[PDB]
Structure formats: C-alpha cells, structure tokens
Amino acid sequence: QIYSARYSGVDVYEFIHSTGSIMKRKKDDWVNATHILKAANFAKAKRTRILEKEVLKETHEKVQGGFGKYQGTWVPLNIAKQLAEKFSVYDQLKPLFDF
C-alpha cells in the first residue's frame, strides 16, 4: 500500500515494501534511490558503492542532513525508473512510480 506522509517538512508518498518503505516526493516526483537499492536487497557497503558509481554522476540531491527515513540520495523519476530496472525491482516498485 501507499500512504501519504510528511518528513522534515516534505510531503511524500510512502510505499510499504518488505525491505522497508520507498518514498516519492509529491512536489516533484523525485524518488529516494537509496530506498530503491535497499529494495534490491543490497547491503550498505554495496549500496554506497553503487550510489557513488551509478547515481552521483546523475542529477540528484544528497539529503544527509534531513534526519529520518527521509535521508538518502534523491533522483528524478525517470532516473529512478532506470535504476529500478537495472537492479530488477522495477515491477515491484511500479505501483509507486505510476502512483
């Protein structure tokens, strides 16, 4: 399911996945790419490696100051879709993307 929520003054849509929740911002449809990587079942050291190699060269926002589940690397919707496809979780996260 997808809940409406707010964190650090930001309104998001929260999708409840087994590995955790995945968020999309209401204002611009950006998605938390860290949540996408957690959904692919990647451990922390590997998620960091992938973010530093595949995502930081992309348009993104590094939220490491906004404490909470909100923290992470946020990316445009189209870039999050690519990432989700690459690591084969696109069909699992599809509801949130098209939501």
UniProtKB/Swiss-Prot annotation:
<comment type="subunit">
    <text>Component of the transcription complex MCB-binding factor (MBF) composed of SWI6 and MBP1. Interacts with MSA1.</text>
</comment>
<protein>
    <recommendedName>
        <fullName>Transcription factor MBP1</fullName>
    </recommendedName>
</protein>
<feature type="domain" description="HTH APSES-type">
    <location>
        <begin position="2"/>
        <end position="99"/>
    </location>
</feature>
<feature type="DNA-binding region" description="H-T-H motif">
    <location>
        <begin position="33"/>
        <end position="54"/>
    </location>
</feature>
<comment type="function">
    <text>Binds to MCB elements (Mlu I cell cycle box) found in the promoter of most DNA synthesis genes. Transcriptional activation by MBF has an important role in the transition from G1 to S phase. It may have a dual role in that it behaves as an activator of transcription at the G1-S boundary and as a repressor during other stages of the cell cycle.</text>
</comment>
